[PDB]
Design a protein around this nucleic acid. Structure first.
Ligand SMILES: [Mg+2]
Ligand SMILES: [Mg+2]
Ligand SMILES: [Mg+2]
Ligand SMILES: [Mg+2]
Ligand SMILES: [Mg+2]
Ligand SMILES: [Mg+2]
Ligand SMILES: [Mg+2]
Ligand SMILES: [Mg+2]
Ligand SMILES: [Mg+2]
Ligand SMILES: [Mg+2]
Ligand SMILES: [Mg+2]
Ligand SMILES: [Mg+2]
Ligand SMILES: [Mg+2]
Ligand SMILES: [Mg+2]
Ligand SMILES: [Mg+2]
Ligand SMILES: [Mg+2]
Ligand SMILES: [Mg+2]
Ligand SMILES: [Mg+2]
Ligand SMILES: [Mg+2]
Ligand SMILES: [Mg+2]
Ligand SMILES: [Mg+2]
Ligand SMILES: [Mg+2]
Ligand SMILES: [Mg+2]
Ligand SMILES: [Mg+2]
Ligand SMILES: [Mg+2]
Ligand SMILES: [Mg+2]
Ligand SMILES: [Mg+2]
Ligand SMILES: [Mg+2]
Ligand SMILES: [Mg+2]
Ligand SMILES: [Mg+2]
Ligand SMILES: [Mg+2]
Ligand SMILES: [Mg+2]
Ligand SMILES: [Mg+2]
Ligand SMILES: [Mg+2]
Ligand SMILES: [Mg+2]
Ligand SMILES: [Mg+2]
Ligand SMILES: [Mg+2]
Ligand SMILES: [Mg+2]
Ligand SMILES: [Mg+2]
Ligand SMILES: [Mg+2]
Ligand SMILES: [Mg+2]
Ligand SMILES: [Mg+2]
Ligand SMILES: [Mg+2]
Ligand SMILES: [Mg+2]
Ligand SMILES: [Mg+2]
Ligand SMILES: [Mg+2]
Ligand SMILES: [Mg+2]
Ligand SMILES: [Mg+2]
Ligand SMILES: [Mg+2]
Ligand SMILES: [Mg+2]
Ligand SMILES: [Mg+2]
Ligand SMILES: [Mg+2]
Ligand SMILES: [Mg+2]
Ligand SMILES: [Mg+2]
Ligand SMILES: [Mg+2]
Ligand SMILES: [Mg+2]
Ligand SMILES: [Mg+2]
Ligand SMILES: [Mg+2]
Ligand SMILES: [Mg+2]
Ligand SMILES: [Mg+2]
Ligand SMILES: [Mg+2]
Ligand SMILES: [Mg+2]
Ligand SMILES: [Mg+2]
Ligand SMILES: [Mg+2]
Ligand SMILES: [Mg+2]
Ligand SMILES: [Mg+2]
Ligand SMILES: [Mg+2]
Ligand SMILES: [Mg+2]
Ligand SMILES: [Mg+2]
Ligand SMILES: [Mg+2]
Ligand SMILES: [Mg+2]
Lengths: 119, 135, 99, 87, 50, 60, 206
RNA sequence: UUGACCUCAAAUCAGGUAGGAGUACCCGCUGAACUUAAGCAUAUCAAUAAGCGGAGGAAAAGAAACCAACCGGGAUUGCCU
RNA sequence: AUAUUGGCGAGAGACCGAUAGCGAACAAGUACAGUGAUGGAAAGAUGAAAAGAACUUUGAAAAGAGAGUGAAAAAGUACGU
RNA sequence: CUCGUAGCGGUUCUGACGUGCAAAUCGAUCGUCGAAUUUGGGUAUAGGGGCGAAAGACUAAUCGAACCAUCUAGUAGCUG
RNA sequence: UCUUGGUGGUAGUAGCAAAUAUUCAAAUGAGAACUUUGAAGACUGAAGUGGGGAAAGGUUCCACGUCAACAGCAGUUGGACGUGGGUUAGUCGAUCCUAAGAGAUGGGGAAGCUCCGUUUCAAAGGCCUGAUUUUAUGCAGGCCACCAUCGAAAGGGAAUC
RNA sequence: AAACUUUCAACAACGGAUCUCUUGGUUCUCGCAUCGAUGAAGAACGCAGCGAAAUGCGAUACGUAAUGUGAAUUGCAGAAUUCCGUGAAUCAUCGAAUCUUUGAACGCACAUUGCGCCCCUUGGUAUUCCAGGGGGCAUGCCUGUUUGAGCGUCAUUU
């Protein structure tokens, strides 16, 4: 059937690392039996179990780094957002809305009034 | 003058198109200056240029360039227009002052070919515009 | 209407000098303080043959004035110059063949 | 002897495989690819070669990364994860 | 050429593993139109051009 | 006789065979097969017996 | 625009014992040596390729448009042309068939077809939905799968539900008096559509 | 001795940024010939195709060194004329 | 406001209907040709469902002749007409 | 230098063949055979250009101007 | 002398005649001029029709099964078809070196694609310290003047019979 | 009189026309703006219990995570307590990852699976040799840091 990921989030780093080793033994041992048998579909289950454990280990490791660079400048570049190269060249929301104080005075003095041609 | 390369200086067109030596290069020497500086400094945007010297062989220009990634330009609202991507390499697209001069972009009856580009105008005035109910 | 052989020689493709076997550039010793105010003594060690040249080359060996090492200049050999001959280059030198 | 017995002496190679396009167009003496123009930075394309632009343009291969941009655009370039657990 | 590059042997290795007929169970699949391997190559009939 | 990664040299074959199968290797001869796979002839030292170890892996 | 031209063919000329049409160059594909570019050649361009700048929409004088609309409304009077154009209206009491303005505020399709049958448009209604036939050519797979007849046109002055209540009914078309489509009044350029007028519609026609 | 200044360097220094793609449309540069003129050199094709450089969702242009000569209009763009 | 034979998402048609329509309805820029730039195809349709012909017999076999299946085998994978 | 093999060429039969074995071969007869020889690999020269002990020869069966794509459905008082 | 596809007559015709040459028996098989074995006759005749290799090919090598198509007759055979097996290096090559040459950098030209140049008009740099307790061996002396890189499976080259 | 040749018909051939179909093309319209040094487009090689392609993916390899749906996939085979469930599935969606060798491609090179150098670390008695694991080392330019050069140059010094 295979390992379930929600179980593997609950284990620690040393529990998951040893589980990967035992899974790699089971893949190796089944790869031997596949040379005698004509069809061994259990390869697929152990192989996706390895991919599941290796995934959960990496999500534990990347979340440790996110707590390491938590709320400072200069995250690592793969922990930065991957919008679009143009979308991160991109004058930010603060910088695009910058207004010189000569323009800030005019915008406060004479904003667009709300009005209607009725009366 | 621009020397037309055309190896051994040879035509192979009409004799109207037979000149090699006397071709004059529609963009100015100030434009070549900014284009060559903008290639060396592609992290910057060329803003303007100005003559500083000349001799028998060279004209000398000083080119003003602006860093669109420095935060003293990305803030300070008087200058962060240069940080928008429409202004990537203005000097190659001819959007500098010497580019707009040599493109002919000026108001008036003297610039009827070149007001919104001579090529755009030529496309407009050579288009057969047909309507649904033919006029 | 085709480019002639005398024009094609300037492109220098198959018309270059066959210069593999040549012994070097046959030049004089570079003009320095030794050859401008006194002299310097050389020694012929070989009268060799230069490929493509009808004149023999004399390999004349001098001492470097400023560093302890030997500098081998390549001369065109003068008729009468032999191996083992001391050769004098400079201003104060004596008139002998090969000086 | 210009036809058939001259065809016997064809056992050399002018081009081998290009590293950039894998095409047997890398001229081994000129050190250049005849189709993609490697090692030059720009990729060899010509507007008189409209069929030749068609053979190698965007869409002809896998598009490992552009085949996902439209979905990421449509969702507004989300960051994070979906909320709930199950049905 | 008995002293190959690895890049030649790697493409030579790929061509041998492609040098098989169609698997017979593929012709039994639902809505299947594949009758045969249309990309079959022989050393005798078509040179594969490096 | 093993099938190994194409990226594995004769040191990484010898190191892996030693700590997976608790043997000692006398020699490794390696060839890349005409299907593009790498085949390792791993000969053990005389203290071990490759017939017993073949049953201990599971094949024959 | 590039149909029949995505081919680099040139003529072999004379001397080759075959006609001088451009033949495809190359070798080893079957296409090689085949004639190209002609209207008579397989794969070639057609003669005089059709353009989008052919005249599609045609201009009619506004008064000649209105001339035809007035003569079409006049033809939806006395019943000879209404019988002639189909339109089972023998058992109608009188033409023009004017019904009350209360039809304009019927909002249910059940109540709408009750009213049209009660004023005698039942046989015209059953003439449609017994004439549903499959189209007789390639147009049935150009989203034109089914053909049927035209039914009674219902003309109103105010929409207060009659358009939506008569929307699903096969063959029954609706119209404001302010518009009065000629494609509805004389379908097929055949004068005499069966028209049911509401009373507000009929007064407004002055 | 020492401390600046100016100019110029170096670093696997701290942070960044440029290249390539695509290119229908857009801004430039460069630039033909077939063709027509019942020949053809001006001309025309054509300030076009091909070639090169640079952008964006539009671009460019744009708030007058304008049009006018009227009782004057009023940035730019595009449609009808 | 304007352009948009590219991309993404739609909705249409008095368009074409497998020698047509894109070169390509199909593992198509594929198979293949060329040193290379480049060139460049052919090729859709059993049946409502494989029900794709068990079994017998003749033959070394392919297969035939029966038998069957099927509405139809004047639909037998060489398959609508 | 010579006779003459291997080799490298190609005189004559105007031989065979001439829908060939072959889009240049086959056979006999021949030139020359220690150098201005013959030859593999590497390398350089690219189209109005190269290269040419020079024949407008050769430059992938293409040469008094290669090949590929585009302009281009180039134009035709001419033939179907 | 249209285009694409299909089909005829010619016509069971022309032809399948270079490289001296085949023959007997048995075996296998449905079937043997052609397969296998034995016997015999012959030939290439060491500048070979013999043993290896270079380029090129790419699995054609080898085994088993098989004969619809292919081997211009045949076919039980096969370089065909189906399924597999097979290529082991410190010493053989590549890798390294330079050759003719190719080619970056500094720099100059060119509107530009890019061109020139390979030591130039550049501030172009690593090498050992004698030998170790304040040494991640330098925070030191001291030395060196050249200046990328690619280029040979026939040249140069560490070592296996 | 046959045979032969010719004509027509039937049945059988050859061939794939005709008719009918159509997950394709073509043209028009409407809406949107989103590639890449955070490594794109393109390429190569590989990956499935049995796949040569197309499609998908990258040694976590016709996929992992997550979320939604709610019991399949299937040509076989296998599994199907999991099936009133954190739950089938070649499902949909997709925000988390992985993403070989490349490629603008970036230590040097590339007709090579060729060769360096640095840091951390492991083993072989090892700072130096050999190997394994991890992480690096391109160019231009900008800002800043630090270390510097120049009798360019200013003060200041027994
Ligand atoms: Mg001139
Ligand atoms: Mg209109
Ligand atoms: Mg020739
Ligand atoms: Mg010939
Ligand atoms: Mg090629
Ligand atoms: Mg491009
Ligand atoms: Mg390789
Ligand atoms: Mg090997
Ligand atoms: Mg080996
Ligand atoms: Mg067509
Ligand atoms: Mg019809
Ligand atoms: Mg840094
Ligand atoms: Mg434009
Ligand atoms: Mg423009
Ligand atoms: Mg005209
Ligand atoms: Mg004319
Ligand atoms: Mg004239
Ligand atoms: Mg003329
Ligand atoms: Mg003009
Ligand atoms: Mg153009
Ligand atoms: Mg964009
Ligand atoms: Mg807009
Ligand atoms: Mg703008
Ligand atoms: Mg003003
Ligand atoms: Mg105005
Ligand atoms: Mg489009
Ligand atoms: Mg048909
Ligand atoms: Mg077609
Ligand atoms: Mg080829
Ligand atoms: Mg059919
Ligand atoms: Mg059914
Ligand atoms: Mg039967
Ligand atoms: Mg029937
Ligand atoms: Mg039957
Ligand atoms: Mg029938
Ligand atoms: Mg039938
Ligand atoms: Mg002689
Ligand atoms: Mg003689
Ligand atoms: Mg001889
Ligand atoms: Mg002759
Ligand atoms: Mg003759
Ligand atoms: Mg023949
Ligand atoms: Mg002699
Ligand atoms: Mg020889
Ligand atoms: Mg010339
Ligand atoms: Mg002559
Ligand atoms: Mg040509
Ligand atoms: Mg023509
Ligand atoms: Mg024909
Ligand atoms: Mg015939
Ligand atoms: Mg005969
Ligand atoms: Mg005979
Ligand atoms: Mg003999
Ligand atoms: Mg003999
Ligand atoms: Mg056998
Ligand atoms: Mg035969
Ligand atoms: Mg046979
Ligand atoms: Mg064999
Ligand atoms: Mg086989
Ligand atoms: Mg050796
Ligand atoms: Mg080197
Ligand atoms: Mg080397
Ligand atoms: Mg030597
Ligand atoms: Mg048939
Ligand atoms: Mg027909
Ligand atoms: Mg349309
Ligand atoms: Mg998997
Ligand atoms: Mg799930
Ligand atoms: Mg699933
Ligand atoms: Mg090499
Ligand atoms: Mg090296």
């Amino acid at each position: 059937a295979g390992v379930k990921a929600y179980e593997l989030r609950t284990k620690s780093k040393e529990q998951l690392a040893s589980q990967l080793v035992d899974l790699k033994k089971e893949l190796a041992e089944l790869k031997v039996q596949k040379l005698s048998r004509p069809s061994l579909p259990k390869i697929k289950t152990v192989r996706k179990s390895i991919a599941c454990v290796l995934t959960v280990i990496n999500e534990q490791q990347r979340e440790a780094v996110r707590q390491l660079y938590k709320g400072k400048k200069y995250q690592p570049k793969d922990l930065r957002a991957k919008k679009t190269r143009a979308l991160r060249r991109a004058l930010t929301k603060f910088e695009a809305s910058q207004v010189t104080e000569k323009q800030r005075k005019k915008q406060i003095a004479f904003p667009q009034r709300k009005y209607a041609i009725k009366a | 003058n621009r020397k037309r390369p055309v190896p051994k200086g040879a035509t192979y067109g009409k004799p109207t198109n037979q000149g090699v030596n006397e071709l004059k290069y529609q963009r100015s020497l100030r434009a070549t200056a900014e284009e060559r500086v903008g290639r060396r400094a592609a992290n910057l945007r060329v803003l303007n240029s100005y003559w500083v010297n000349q001799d028998s062989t060279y004209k000398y220009f000083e080119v003003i360039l602006v860093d669109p990634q420095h935060k003293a330009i990305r803030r300070d609202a008087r200058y962060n227009w240069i940080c928008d991507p429409v202004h990537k390499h203005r000097e190659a697209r001819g959007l500098t002052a010497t580019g707009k001069k040599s493109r002919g972009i000026n108001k008036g009856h003297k610039f009827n070919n070149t007001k919104a580009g001579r090529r755009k105008t030529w496309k407009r005035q050579n288009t057969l515009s047909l309507w649904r109910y033919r006029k | 209407g085709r480019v002639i052989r005398n024009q094609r020689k300037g492109a220098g493709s198959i018309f270059t000098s066959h210069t593999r076997l040549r012994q070097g550039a046959a030049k004089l010793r570079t003009l320095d303080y030794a050859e401008r105010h006194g002299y310097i003594r050389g020694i012929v060690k070989q009268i060799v043959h230069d490929s493509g040249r009808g004149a023999p080359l004399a390999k004349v060996v001098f001492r470097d004035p400023y560093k302890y090492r030997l500098r081998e200049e390549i001369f065109i050999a003068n008729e009468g110059v032999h191996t083992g001959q001391f050769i004098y280059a400079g201003k104060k030198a004596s008139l002998n063949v090969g000086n | 002897g210009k036809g058939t017995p001259s065809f016997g002496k064809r056992h050399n190679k002018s081009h081998t495989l290009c590293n950039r396009c894998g095409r047997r167009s890398f001229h081994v003496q000129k050190k250049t690819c005849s189709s993609c123009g490697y090692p030059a930075a720009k990729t060899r394309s010509y507007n008189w070669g409209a069929k030749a632009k068609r053979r190698h343009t965007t869409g002809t291969g896998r598009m490992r990364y552009l085949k996902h941009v439209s979905r990421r655009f449509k969702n507004g370039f989300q960051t994070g994860s979906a909320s709930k657990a199950s049905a | 050429a008995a002293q190959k590059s690895f890049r030649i042997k790697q493409k030579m290795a790929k061509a041998k593993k492609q040098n098989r007929p169609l698997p017979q169970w593929i012709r039994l699949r639902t809505n299947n139109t594949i009758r045969y391997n249309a990309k079959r190559r022989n050393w005798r009939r078509t040179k594969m051009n490096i | 006789v093993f099938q190994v990664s194409m990226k594995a040299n004769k040191y990484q074959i010898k190191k892996a065979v030693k700590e997976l199968y608790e043997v000692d290797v006398l020699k490794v001869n390696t060839l890349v097969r005409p299907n593009g796979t790498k085949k390792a002839y791993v000969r053990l030292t005389a203290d071990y017996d490759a017939l017993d170890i073949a049953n201990r892996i599971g094949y024959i | 625009e590039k149909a029949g031209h995505q081919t680099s063919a040139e003529s072999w000329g004379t001397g080759r014992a075959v006609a001088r049409i451009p033949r495809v160059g190359g070798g080893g594909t079957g296409r090689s040596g085949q004639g190209a570019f002609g209207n008579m050649c397989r794969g070639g361009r057609m003669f005089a390729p059709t353009k989008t700048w052919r005249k599609w929409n045609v201009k009619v004088n506004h008064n000649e448009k209105r001339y035809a609309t007035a003569s079409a409304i006049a033809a939806t009077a006395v019943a000879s042309l209404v019988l002639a154009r189909g339109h089972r209206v023998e058992k109608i009491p009188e033409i023009p068939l004017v019904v009350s303005t209360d039809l304009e505020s019927i909002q249910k399709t059940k109540e709408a077809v009750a009213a049209l049958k009660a004023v005698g448009a039942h046989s015209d209604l059953l003439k449609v939905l017994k004439s549903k036939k499959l189209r007789a050519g390639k147009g049935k797979y150009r989203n034109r799968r089914w053909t049927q007849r035209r039914g009674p046109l219902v003309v109103y002055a105010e929409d207060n539900g009659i358009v939506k209540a008569l929307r699903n009914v096969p063959g029954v078309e609706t119209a404001n008096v302010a518009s009065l489509n000629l494609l509805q009044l004389a379908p097929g350029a055949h004068l005499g559509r069966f028209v049911i007028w509401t009373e507000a519609a009929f007064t407004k026609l002055d």
